[PDB]
Design a protein around this ligand. Sequence first.
Ligand SMILES: COCc1ccc(-c2cc(C#N)cc([C@@]3(C(C)C)C(C#N)=C(N)Oc4n[nH]c(C)c43)c2)s1
Ligand SMILES: COCc1ccc(-c2cc(C#N)cc([C@@]3(C(C)C)C(C#N)=C(N)Oc4n[nH]c(C)c43)c2)s1
Ligand SMILES: Cc1ncc(COP(=O)(O)O)c(CNCC(=O)O)c1O
Ligand SMILES: Cc1ncc(COP(=O)(O)O)c(CNCC(=O)O)c1O
Ligand SMILES: [Cl-]
Lengths: 442, 442
Amino acid sequence: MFNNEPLEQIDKELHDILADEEKRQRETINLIASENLTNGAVRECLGNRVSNKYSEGYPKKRYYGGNDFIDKIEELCQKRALEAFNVSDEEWGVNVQPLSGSAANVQALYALVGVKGKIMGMHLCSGGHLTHGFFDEKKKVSITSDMFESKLYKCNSQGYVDLDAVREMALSFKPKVIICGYTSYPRDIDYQQFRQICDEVNAYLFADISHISSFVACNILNNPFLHADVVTTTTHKILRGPRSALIFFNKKRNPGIEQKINSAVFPSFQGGPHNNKIAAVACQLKEVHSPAFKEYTQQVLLNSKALAKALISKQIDLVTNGTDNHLIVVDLRKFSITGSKLQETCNAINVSLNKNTIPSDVDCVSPSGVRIGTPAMTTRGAKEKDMEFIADVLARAIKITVDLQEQYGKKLVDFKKGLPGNAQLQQLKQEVVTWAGALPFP
Amino acid sequence: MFNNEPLEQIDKELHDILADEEKRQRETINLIASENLTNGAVRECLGNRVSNKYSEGYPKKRYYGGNDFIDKIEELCQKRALEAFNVSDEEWGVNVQPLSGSAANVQALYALVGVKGKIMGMHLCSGGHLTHGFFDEKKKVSITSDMFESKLYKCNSQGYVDLDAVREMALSFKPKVIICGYTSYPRDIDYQQFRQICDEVNAYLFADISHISSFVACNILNNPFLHADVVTTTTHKILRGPRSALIFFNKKRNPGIEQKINSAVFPSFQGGPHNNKIAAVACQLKEVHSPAFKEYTQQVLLNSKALAKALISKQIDLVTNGTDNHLIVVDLRKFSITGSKLQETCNAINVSLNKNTIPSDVDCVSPSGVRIGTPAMTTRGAKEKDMEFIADVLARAIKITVDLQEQYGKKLVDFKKGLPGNAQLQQLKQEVVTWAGALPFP
Ligand SMILES: COCc1ccc(-c2cc(C#N)cc([C@@]3(C(C)C)C(C#N)=C(N)Oc4n[nH]c(C)c43)c2)s1
Ligand SMILES: COCc1ccc(-c2cc(C#N)cc([C@@]3(C(C)C)C(C#N)=C(N)Oc4n[nH]c(C)c43)c2)s1
Ligand SMILES: Cc1ncc(COP(=O)(O)O)c(CNCC(=O)O)c1O
Ligand SMILES: Cc1ncc(COP(=O)(O)O)c(CNCC(=O)O)c1O
Ligand SMILES: [Cl-]
């Protein structure tokens, strides 16, 4: 008693937009640092009937019948997660049920500190996440600043984490958790240094490695598992998995953390797991552990180094003057333009990026930077040689932006008036589409 | 620079379990009240590349470029959501980003009351959800009992919502929110009555209709939208959508609630939306509004009435002695067995259900009932005549459970010893598989 017609026949309106979205994807230079493109295997999992199952609880301890195969799927995922990060299942445990990074982080923090608990995070303007305790004067923007008491450490004027400031703050504030690992931080992390600071104030060490997860797995960047109590990561970014998250806990450093973390995920916060996610994560995790994915990850950094190099060669300023990973933040101050305007210009030419703050910024709405990343284009087979081209495309977008600000003015509404029908933008978009459309598309 | 081998070739281990799960689903009599089976169209959406996109914020108000088609999909979902529940976009608004029912509820509650805020909900043992403020004497089981201050109302010994008790509690406790609409409540709800109590005490009216959403939409049961400030519902249950949730808010009753709810979903709790979810919800909502889905929803109740009738004819006791909806709770006390045991026995025969508490219950690990539901089997084309068979199968499982308890004992571990190889169970499972395996399967 159901309709079985395929999507095209059953919902032609929706299918058209999705075909449109697909085309836009195929024809964009995607520089969103947090984006990637999943393979068919991961999407076959997301589309699977395994999402039919209600399976509240944990494997072997469900609140429903019919969970025999779901248990195998949940355990294989946990297995592959611990494998992927080269941690012994004896020392480290993992929860594979958080629906997304924001959820995982809120869950993990509560497990560690509870309501009104004290937490320390990097500020949003400095590269930190919303879920790292963010608030402004006016409002408690994230729940992490409301259900928890938070204080926020800023990076220095150069854009690097100031460990001195971190220690200064920890000794006065006395938090139960300190969060490191970031959303738009272009440099590696001194985890050991964080560990020594946490030890001084009897605080937990929280490493959110969502952006840099593939580097950690493939042993290309610092390994937070050597020092961290809790490691979170999303699966949809550099890891190239589906949209989901993982919570890792050091059982050996903290006995009874397993129960604490697991009870926080369920039944404190979530209900039924999304088993299609868990299946998809499992699939990607197998791939994460291969020598071939290590190659992909290496190429991500090769590409990011080259892109930084080529942008510098064109007189563009970068926060920290380079990168240790997949991501770059461009400081646009010398051009007297905003990230907001550069975002609109880049969208008009099919270049995906986002506006981003820099250390000197005081404005969340009008930032002085854009953030770019290589994981998506690296997935699409782009190499170091291709980076000069992206660098050139961005330079030209910056120039065009300066011109349009000259013609139409500083107001964002006024500025957008110049984008449609602009001859150079049309020429640039076509230039973008031609190269982007030809690249391998999973 | 990726792998494009299909799931079968890329990950054979995982593909086998999924095919195993698919086989089990096809050959199970699914009586889990919160379960359904999605069509291929909904699964093509969950599998779509649209999940590649990061689109934090709201349509037209994104924090990333290249969201032109993502905006159309998020808007068409809001459009179809309000359409399906027969509400005007001028009076009612909706958020389509909550990832699941538990998140949406925590999100919606925070919006209304904030941290330390006061809320009222039905007790878990009485039929209410975890996210309705549930706590134990020992522990604050749900975050809804911890980040909020909660009180819990119990149904009477007959299993009906006791409005006297609700009012008595509301006048003393003075909550800011009162929650109605439930997880395992077999009767319709007097929303008007709740509204009168909420008015008296200046409390918001919260109706969580996840279990009964299709009834509300198709105007087969009481409409909470006539009276409620906030309406939440998951999409994966009787709605037969993907795993996601919706928050509805009455703008006419509460100006400024839109910003409150929207900011609570993001950036208070979540980060990037799951666009494949939104696409899938949109697709199912078109179907919800059709006269053909009204037919399906009618069948669900016709089947649930019949099944209740047939169980009573076999001397099985029901909570409230019947049903107003898709769900029944069987009181097993007269048989001196637990739901836990009946759940294992039913799993052994390919009958999916869950153990459920009853009003006299004081125990959560071992309850005195099972909960059953018709949405899945109705989806599979089963009619009123088919219900006698399901009733017969359950009666037979109950008997086998009494026998096995006599032989092996009251300990759950001891009891399970008797399940494998049992000739009657093998006979019953085969009877189950034959009939279920031949039913239409989306
Ligand atoms: C309405 O509350 C104030 C805000 C919520 C999110 C804000 C935000 C603004 C900007 C800018 N420009 C950038 C961000 C960024 C980037 C990555 C997009 C951002 C930056 N820069 C950082 N550090 O973390 C984030 N988490 N989520 C989002 C959307 C961000 C966040 S401002
Ligand atoms: C951590 O200990 C406290 C608990 C968490 C879940 C508990 C629970 C036990 C039983 C039993 N028997 C039943 C439930 C039910 C049913 C639908 C399965 C349940 C019941 N009965 C109700 N009312 O709501 C629920 N939300 N989530 C779950 C799993 C439930 C929940 S008790
Ligand atoms: C470090 C970090 N942690 C958690 C999250 C949250 O994940 P969800 O959005 O899946 O909830 C993000 C999102 N990052 C925003 C970006 O870099 O584009 C992040 O950068
Ligand atoms: C009334 C109600 N509200 C919210 C939820 C939460 O949904 P998620 O599991 O998607 O977070 C449930 C789950 N229902 C459990 C059951 O009836 O089987 C529910 O029954
Ligand atoms: Cl999903």
